[PDB]
Write a protein that binds this ligand. Structure first.
Ligand SMILES: *P(=O)(O)OCC(C)(C)[C@@H](O)C(N)=O
Length: 1813
């Protein structure tokens, strides 16, 4: 050992590494500060270990301790050196790992000692990768420190390469800590500066235009009125005016104004200024004369291009160049020499309408070129297109209309103001001229969608928020976004489907969009922020406004890129698109809620009458703001209708206060809706619309003031709904308490039946006035010990079962800015310690009573630590320690300070801190940190405990107990969630998963509940109940737990203590009714439970007499909680920490945060994993969206399984399509017999039949059957044993045309006469011993008489289609008389081809005919050899029971394929174990019953190289349906029946016909090609079992009646019949688990487990066993009590010798002994009456070794052998007690053999001692 100097700055002082070094008994000196070269901490030091050290050691220290300074770096060096290594490992996509290296004089450039490779997942957050890396570097140290300190590791130098990163290089990506890895990279690809990007722009617009004029010179360029201009004509004319302009003094970057109207000369003038070298300044001729003069002076334009009509509008301010004067055009028509560069200005357009007069935005040539070169290929603009010059030329909308289409050869069409505003005439012009593409502003576009257009193919819109997508046209709709400072637009989106917020799209060419926060840092995907624009669109800036240019056009402080502040809020969507979220200044406060008014307009325009809408947020002089909803409709809409239409999806404050009807929205001269031209409302004096009905009396006024105090709404109306205007459960109790001071009593349920003041008055009329119903809480006097509450006694008892448990520790974290004083927080916390007695309360136990003791003062543990982002969790973890309830304070605090935040953490116990106590602790701490004075407390918790304990003696408490004792009586429901194997003991290890409900859906949830007199909790509880029901196999009742506030006395809502109470909720789900009906039923069961909510949970368990199990929590196993919105801002920034604990199997907590819902899924990690919970979270979201949109839909119509799961099930299971030859099996025989007539086909006994001999004899009987009246789909019955004649009959039946119906010859006459009639058949092909057995039914032939054959040996003609019957197999199933399954040829062919693809029987192979032909399995043996042209070895009749004969057939005939039903394979492998004969066997195909798990190794040990296969299939699916290949080294927990065969499909549905997900059980259904036509002469049963289903799209499915479940692998698991199911209080059980112990018992070879209903009806768990030993009940019970719990412990164990199998080898559950019988059981104890028995008990105790022997104990049960009896009889003989060893077998007990053991009386009278002499 040696001294170690541990250097850490951002890690803990007692890390996992430091304390492991102390376990090895090292002296670990810890120094967190900068160490000097000659310090005391450097003396007598042998090793230096560093872990997150934030300083650089001196160069002397590195050399003085060279080879002795070890560093722990969580990065795979040389990659990611320096600071923040784990983040840069993910962002730069470097290799991942951890490194323990040596320290040199640089940053992480030392020789590596040990290095491991870590793996991060795509769905892991960055914080998750931080913990996973910190653990690896700590585990790597623990694993290798001994090898390091002992020199058993040679340092190897770092390989070449790697990255180096410093501090503050991450400041741009600070918000992305909770972002997944795949989303972090997705943002990188979407926002990182591209390497090479695109080619740099090197052209101006007039350069590219002049090149297009050379390409399409005679194409039509511009069309105005009826005249037209070609590209050459337009080019030459502009060149003429440009020569004049340049000669007049036009230089590059000069600004030439243009004041013309939309005409051909406008296009000429624009191109002329460009060709001259300047930039055109568009001035609308209709502007005010002051606006015109402002632009001319601001632009400093010396030349103005106008005509004579608008000439005087300049007032002689410029050199007027008339566009109609011929002298203004020169004679030179050639292109001018180029004097411009791509950096020169191309146009200047002024924008305004707000702050400032007007600002001149300057755009350059490269800006416009980049847009036009993106516009043409994006929309496919060709010279065949025709565009519309719609927008005013003073705005970039015209730049898109003109410049983009000119560079593609298209034609421009000028729009006069006669059609610019009459959109009906514009649609006429477009349809009659062929206008194919154009840009229309948002307002004009939405009013153009109604017109019937056939000309447009692409219509682009933008400017305002697009909401309308339905249009009367065949054109594609595009939505664009972009400021005027950038070129026209920067993002484009094709509107493909309806959207709530239509995205603005993805950036264009050479353009990148960033979503940044206020600190200019990158926001994660989905997080809102300010939109920034980078790329070639950013112009120069504003004209003569350099301050505003430097304000909006900024270079980024870190990325070093020029960006434009848009002032708009947007977020990135996961698809890569951007969506507009509003302007950063248009956020207004309505009723105390910050809302975006743009979120109201889409719902209002969805009204069937509203076409346009705009919601403004005006204000009054008092300061309050009100929302006004302007709408354009054909006529006015009543105020109540618009209030109701928006009340379906929006809250009350988002419903506008007033609505204004408009006929046409006033547009500005620029295409936008004139917002300041909308009519201001007249009633703007705090008017409450019109639904306001003023209070008419003194009670309605008194109720309106109480409602105003609780809800915070001024002037309430008597018709206002409580829940609709912010009403909550807490606010209902506040209304009740506020009425108690008035004197009126209101119950909690009566508010939901009287939700308005109008109804509340009518209820409070009969209610008495001033009575003082509420009594004040009496403050207890000072005592030594105080009383504890019922919940405090429970929480105490909980913490006592494991005194070191943190399962009830309450840990929260708040992230403060670094500017907050750490000690100021500690002082505020120490003030809260004395303010509340709970923070100074200690709990002890006086005898058997738990009492509380108050302490005057207690010191607070405030641990200040320094940490990094990637270590805050590990630091906080090491602080969560168990609490001693006898010591105060029950709360520990501390602040972890990082380089960017101060993380305050506090850990308390649930005995003190509950839901409301957290809210009060937040408000008081926030006020103390704000230096606000607090009013001292008035009440204490110790006094409420006294008041409540006395209420436990009242009559109302007994009345509430009687509720729970009757509510929870009888058999309660059982919720079997699809969990993993439940551990024997209850486990508390857990994890969480979070699901966010967006604000929009949250608003629709709360508006729905309030509209139907429900709370959000009632609505969520119904969805949770349905969600649990559908997972519990669509049960009708469910059970779950909930949490109430438990604040009984109204004076306790300001105290700090444990008040919450747990309530069981027994709810019912009616799947046949609507979602609204179930909503009322959940409330009808919740309100009576809340009326009895103040009975402690442990008393409720006692009243119900709930039995305690080990695997499940008592009563319920799923918990559902819900908290309200945070009261303060500090509570909203608090974060609840879970220390890997799940108190229940599954816990759901709904938290109202950020105007949305954060739903937590706390689950036990032993029952669920990461994948299972993710499925259930998606299913809850799927049910929530279906329910909120289907209020009136039946609950049965809501599906649980998701579409991604349905596609996953299709591929892994039901993708079995394969093309198979349609050649029938009777033709394949005659085809093979033709090619190979002299090949062996059948082998019976020791005789062989060739293909020709077989086919010829088949033809003779066929020709005989043909003339007998055999046609397709005719039935002929067979009565023959296993022989060659049976095979000839079957094939001759098929060749003749009919189907063969197998009948056992040895079947009773009662059975045949049934099939003889049900089938209606006539011919009976029977053998000689069974000819008269048909009783001459009709025409009976003799298969052994040559008269029944013919002489024609030629193949009969083909007379069968693939849809004709091939055989009819009767079932004789349980609970029913035999039914004839009709199988067709194509159905049989698909299975034979399918089984040949998996187990190919080739020509050199053979099959064994051993299954009785009245079973479908035999058919696979009858025809299984034909496809591969093999052979069939017919076993001797009744030789299927002799494993000797079966094994001889496999050896002698080289059989490769064999069928074996289980329970018949076990006797076969029991014969082959002591065998060694050679075998050609390849496949053992098992079918008929469930395969025992122990049989798989038994088969592979007696037969290596074989392929054991478990196969399942009902008779209605021909032969088989699914298969599963079993391997050697395998131990499957059941025997999965596997996946369906080719062209087979299997579905597992519930009781409502919905596909069940993985793990959830249901009914197995078959579908595909090989389905039976139906049941013979039973169309009723055919409809019940062969039903059409939407899964097969109208095609039939066969309902097997078997219970089954999907597995994560995809193989289906057999769970037994749907009927004959055994449950344990609803929670079911698997009998195979009980049959495990029977196999574990070596002497118990085989045994079965079922049930039997007793005389009264209760089924007892009867087990049937056979073995070589005699047991007892007690011995068999104890052997099961190993791991099998008591709820599965059976009872009657009747001993058997063989199992009652039937003809199919399965043990008849009926034929099992019904009334038990030979159930071995023990007797009582002992009573050695006489000393003889006591002597017998002592001698038995010595020989048998049993220290306690009873007089009624069986000799053999205590270890009685034949050797023991001789010892016992010998010891008795030595004390004169004759015992016969034979009697011990007849009388095996002491008392039974006591009268039979006699004495050896030796008399001892002697010979007459009186002797003489
Ligand atoms: P409302 O039923 O929505 O309130 C929710 C509960 C029942 C949790 C609340 O009343 C409470 N803390 O008891």
């Amino acid at each position: 050992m040696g001294r170690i100097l541990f250097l850490t700055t951002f890690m803990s002082k007692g890390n996992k590494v430091v304390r492991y070094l102390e376990s090895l008994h090292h002296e670990v000196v810890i120094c967190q500060e900068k160490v000097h070269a000659q310090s005391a901490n450097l003396q007598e030091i042998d090793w230096i270990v560093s872990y997150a050290y934030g300083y650089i050691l001196d160069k002397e220290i590195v050399s003085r301790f060279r080879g002795r300074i070890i560093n722990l770096h969580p990065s795979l060096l040389p990659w990611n050196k320096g600071r923040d290594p784990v983040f840069w490992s993910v962002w730069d996509e470097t290799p991942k790992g951890v490194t323990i290296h040596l320290i040199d004089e640089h940053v992480d450039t030392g020789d590596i000692l040990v290095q491991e490779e870590i793996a991060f997942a795509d769905e892991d957050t960055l914080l998750d990768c931080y913990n996973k890396a910190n653990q690896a570097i700590e585990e790597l140290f623990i694993r290798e420190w001994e090898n390091i300190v002992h020199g058993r590791i040679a340092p190897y130098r770092q390989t070449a390469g790697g990255t180096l990163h410093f501090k503050a290089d991450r400041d741009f990506y600070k918000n992305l800590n909770m972002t997944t890895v795949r989303e972090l990279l997705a943002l990188k690809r979407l926002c990182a500066e591209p390497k090479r990007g695109e080619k740099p722009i090197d052209k101006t617009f007039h350069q590219l235009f002049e090149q297009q004029v050379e390409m399409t010179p005679d194409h039509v360029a511009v069309v105005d009125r009826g005249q037209s201009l070609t590209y050459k004509q337009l080019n030459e004319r502009a060149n003429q005016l440009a020569h004049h302009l340049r000669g007049k003094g036009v230089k590059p970057d000069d600004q030439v104004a243009i004041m013309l109207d939309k005409s051909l000369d406008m296009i000429v003038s624009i191109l002329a200024v460009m060709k001259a070298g300047g930039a055109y300044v568009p001035i609308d001729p209709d502007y005010p004369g002051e606006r015109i003069a402002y632009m001319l002076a601001d632009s400093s334009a010396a030349i103005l291009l106008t005509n004579a009509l608008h000439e005087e509008k300049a007032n002689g301010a410029c050199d007027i160049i008339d566009v109609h004067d011929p002298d203004s055009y020169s004679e030179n028509t050639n292109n001018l020499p180029h004097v411009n560069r791509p950096d020169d200005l191309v146009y200047v357009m002024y924008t305004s309408g707000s702050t400032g007069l007007a600002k001149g935005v300057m755009i350059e040539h490269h800006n416009l070129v980049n847009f036009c070169e993106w516009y043409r290929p994006y929309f496919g603009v060709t010279p065949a297109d025709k565009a519309l010059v719609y927008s005013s030329f003073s705005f970039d909308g015209s730049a898109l209309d003109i410049f983009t289409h000119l560079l593609a050869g298209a034609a421009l069409h000028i729009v006069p103001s006669e059609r610019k505003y009459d959109l009906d005439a514009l649609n006429d012009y477009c349809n009659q001229e062929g206008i194919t593409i154009s840009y229309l502003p948002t307002g004009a576009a939405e009013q153009f969608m109604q017109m019937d257009n056939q000309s447009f193919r692409v219509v682009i819109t933008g400017g305002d928020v697009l909401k309308k997508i339905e249009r009367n046209g065949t054109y594609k709709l595009y939505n664009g976004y972009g400021p005027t400072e950038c070129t026209i637009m920067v993002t484009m989106f094709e509107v493909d489907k309806p959207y709530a917020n239509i995205p603005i799209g993805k950036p264009i060419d050479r353009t990148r969009i960033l979503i940044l926060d206020e600190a200019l840092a990158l926001q994660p995907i989905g997080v809102a922020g300010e939109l920034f624009i980078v790329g070639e669109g950013l112009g120069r800036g504003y004209l003569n406004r350099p301050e505003l240019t430097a304000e909006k056009f900024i270079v980024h402080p870190q990325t070093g890129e020029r960006m434009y502040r848009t002032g708009d809020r947007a977020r990135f969507l996961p698809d890569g698109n951007i969506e507009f979220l509003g302007r950063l200044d248009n956020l207004v406060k309505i009723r105390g809620y910050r809302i975006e008014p743009g979120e109201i307009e889409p719902f209002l325009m969805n009204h069937p009458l509203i076409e346009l809408t705009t919601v403004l947020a005006k204000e009054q002089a008092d300061g309050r703001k009100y929302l006004v909803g302007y709408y354009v409709a054909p006529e006015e809409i009543p105020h109540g209708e618009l209030r109701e239409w928006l009340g379906n999806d929006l809250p009350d404050y988002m419903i506008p206060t007033y609505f204004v009807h408009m006929k046409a929205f006033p547009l500005t001269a620029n295409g936008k809706v004139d917002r300041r031209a909308l009519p201001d409302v007249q009633a703007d004096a705090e008017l409450l619309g019109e639904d306001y009905v003023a209070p008419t009396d003194e009670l309605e006024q008194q109720l309106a003031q109480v409602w105003s105090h609780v809800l915070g709404i001024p002037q309430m109306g008597i018709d206002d709904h409580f829940l609709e205007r912010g009403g909550d459960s807490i606010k209902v109790m506040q209304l009740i308490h506020q009425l108690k001071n008035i004197g009126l009593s209101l119950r909690y349920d009566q508010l939901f039946t009287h939700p308005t003041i109008r109804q509340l008055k009518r209820l409070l009329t009969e209610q008495k006035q001033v009575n003082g119903l509420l009594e004040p809480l009496r403050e207890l006097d000072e005592q030594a010990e105080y009383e504890t509450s019922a919940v405090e006694k429970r929480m105490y008892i909980i913490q006592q079962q494991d005194v070191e448990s943190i399962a009830y520790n309450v840990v929260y974290t708040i992230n403060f800015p670094l500017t907050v004083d750490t000690e100021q927080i500690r002082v505020a916390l120490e003030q809260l310690v004395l303010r509340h007695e709970g923070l100074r309360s200690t709990y002890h136990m006086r005898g058997d009573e738990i009492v509380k003791r108050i302490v005057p003062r207690a010191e607070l543990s405030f641990v200040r630590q320094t940490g990094e982002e990637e270590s805050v969790q590990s630091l906080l973890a090491e602080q969560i320690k168990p609490f001693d309830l006898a010591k105060a304070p029950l709360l520990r605090a501390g602040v972890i300070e990082t380089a960017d935040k101060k993380v305050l953490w506090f850990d308390s116990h649930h005995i003190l801190l509950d839901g409301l106590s957290k809210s009060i602790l937040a408000r008081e701490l926030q006020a103390l940190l704000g230096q606000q004075v607090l009013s001292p407390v008035e009440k204490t918790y110790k006094s409420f405990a006294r008041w409540q304990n006395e209420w436990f003696a009242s009559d109302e408490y007994e009345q509430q107990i009687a509720y729970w004792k009757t509510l929870l009586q009888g058999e309660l429901p059982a919720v079997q969630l699809p969990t993993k194997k439940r551990p024997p003991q209850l486990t508390f290890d857990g994890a969480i998963q979070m699901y966010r409900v967006n604000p929009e859906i949250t608003r629709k949830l709360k508006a729905t509940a309030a509209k139907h007199d429900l709370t959000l909790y009632m609505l969520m509880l119904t969805i949770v109940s349905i969600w649990l029901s559908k997972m519990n196999s669509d049960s009708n009742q469910v059970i779950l737990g909930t949490v109430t506030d438990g604040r009984q006395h109204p004076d306790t809502r300001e105290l700090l203590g444990m008040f919450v109470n747990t309530l069981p909720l027994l709810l019912s789900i009616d799947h046949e009714e609507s979602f609204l009906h179930n909503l009322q039923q959940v409330k009808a069961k919740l309100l009576p439970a809340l009326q009895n909510q103040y009975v402690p949970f442990d008393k409720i368990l006692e009243a119900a007499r709930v039995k305690r199990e080990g695997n499940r929590h008592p009563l319920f196993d799923v918990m559902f909680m819900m908290q309200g919105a945070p009261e303060t801002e500090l509570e909203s920034n608090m974060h609840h920490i879970n220390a890997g604990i799940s108190k229940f199997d599954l816990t759901l907590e709904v938290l109202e945060r950020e105007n949305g819902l954060n739903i937590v899924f706390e689950y036990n990690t032993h029952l669920f994993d990461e994948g299972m919970i993710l499925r259930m979270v998606a299913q809850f979201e799927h049910l929530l969206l279906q329910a909120v949109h289907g209020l009136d839909q039946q609950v049965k119509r809501f599906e649980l399984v998701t579409e991604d799961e349905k596609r996953d099930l299709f591929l892994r299971v039901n993708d079995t399509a394969k093309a198979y030859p349609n050649k029938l099996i009777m033709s394949m025989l005659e085809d093979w017999a033709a090619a190979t007539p002299d090949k062996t086909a059948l082998v019976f006994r020791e005789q062989r039949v060739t293909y020709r001999e077989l086919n010829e004899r088949v033809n003779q009987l066929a020709h005989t059957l043909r003339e007998k009246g055999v046609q397709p789909d005719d039935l002929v019955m067979l009565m023959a044993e296993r022989s060659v004649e049976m095979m000839v009959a079957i094939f001759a039946v098929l060749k003749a045309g009919g189907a063969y119906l197998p009948i056992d010859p040895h079947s009773p006459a009662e059975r045949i006469a049934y099939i003889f009639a049900d089938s209606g058949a006539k011919l009976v092909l029977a053998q000689s011993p069974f000819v008269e057995k048909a009783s001459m039914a009709e025409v009976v032939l003799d298969l052994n008489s040559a008269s029944s054959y013919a002489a024609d040996t030629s193949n009969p003609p083909l007379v069968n289609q693939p849809g004709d019957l091939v055989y009819v197999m009767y079932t004789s199933g349980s609970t029913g008389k035999p039914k004839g399954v009709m199988i067709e040829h194509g159905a049989l062919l698909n299975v034979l081809h399918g089984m040949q693809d998996e187990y190919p029987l080739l020509q050199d192979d053979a099959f064994l005919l051993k299954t009785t032909y009245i079973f479908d399995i035999s058919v696979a043996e009858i025809f299984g050899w034909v496809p591969g042209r093999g052979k069939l070895v017919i076993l001797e009749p009744e030789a299927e029971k002799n494993p000797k004969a079966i094994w001889q057939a496999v050896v002698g005939a080289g059989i490769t394929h064999i069928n074996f039903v289980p329970s018949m394979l076990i006797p076969f492998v029991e014969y082959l174990e002591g065998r060694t004969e050679a075998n050609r066997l390849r496949y053992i195909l098992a079918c008929g019953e469930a395969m025992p798990d122990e049989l798989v190794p038994k088969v592979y040990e007696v037969l290596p190289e074989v392929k054991l296969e478990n196969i399942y299939g009902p008779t209605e699916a021909t032969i088989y349906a699914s298969r599963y290949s079993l391997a050697k080294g395998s131990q499957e927990s059941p025997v999965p029946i596997g996946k369906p065969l080719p062209n087979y499909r299997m579905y597992i549905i519930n009781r409502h016909g919905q596909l069940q997900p993985i793990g959830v059980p249901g009914e197995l259904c078959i579908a595909g090609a090989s389905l039976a036509r139906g049941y013979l002469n039973n169309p009723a049963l055919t409809e019940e079992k062969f039903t059409p289903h939407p899964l097969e799209k109208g095609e039939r499915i066969y309902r097997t009646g078997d219970l089954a479940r999907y597995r994560e692998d995809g193989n289906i698991e057999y769970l037994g019949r749907m009927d004959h199911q055994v449950k344990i209080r609803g929670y079911r059980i698997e009998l195979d688990e009980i049959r495990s112990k029977l196999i574990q018992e070596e002497t118990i070879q085989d045994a079965v487990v079922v049930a039997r209903n007793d005389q009264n009806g209760q089924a007892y768990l009867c087990a049937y066993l056979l073995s070589e030993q005699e047991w007892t009940v007690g011995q068999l019970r104890e052997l099961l009590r190993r791991e099998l719990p008591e709820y599965m412990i059976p009872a009657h164990f009747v001993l058997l010798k063989q199992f009652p199998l039937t003809a199919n080898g399965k043990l008849d559950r009926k034929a099992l002994p019904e009334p038990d019988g030979s159930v071995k059981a023990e007797a009582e104890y002992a009573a050695p009456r006489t000393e003889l028995e006591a002597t017998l008990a002592h001698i038995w105790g010595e020989v048998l070794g049993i220290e306690r022997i009873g007089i009624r104990d069986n000799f053999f049960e205590l270890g009685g052998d034949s050797i023991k009896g001789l010892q016992i009889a010998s010891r008795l003989q030595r004390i004169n007690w004759t015992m016969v060893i034979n009697h011990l077998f007849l009388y095996p007990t002491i008392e039974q053999i006591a009268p039979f053991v006699t004495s050896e009386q030796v008399v001892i009278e002697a010979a007459a001692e009186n002797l003489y002499f």
